[PDB]
Amino acid sequence: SGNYVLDLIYSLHKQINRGLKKIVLGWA
């Protein structure tokens, strides 16, 4: 408890955002 279970889910959110950025915005 105490701001928990939310930050762990966002840890993956950044991996998807940065994962689909250098390869997605790098081949246009």
Side-chain angles (χ1 to χ4, degrees):
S1 212
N3 221 102
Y4 192 64
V5 191
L6 210 89
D7 286 73
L8 262 297
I9 295 303
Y10 210 87
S11 183
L12 196 80
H13 188 92
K14 253 273 154 90
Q15 237 79 94
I16 297 149
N17 199 281
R18 220 229 87 110
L20 282 109
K21 195 162 241 89
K22 64 189 239 266
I23 287 164
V24 169
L25 214 90
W27 277 122

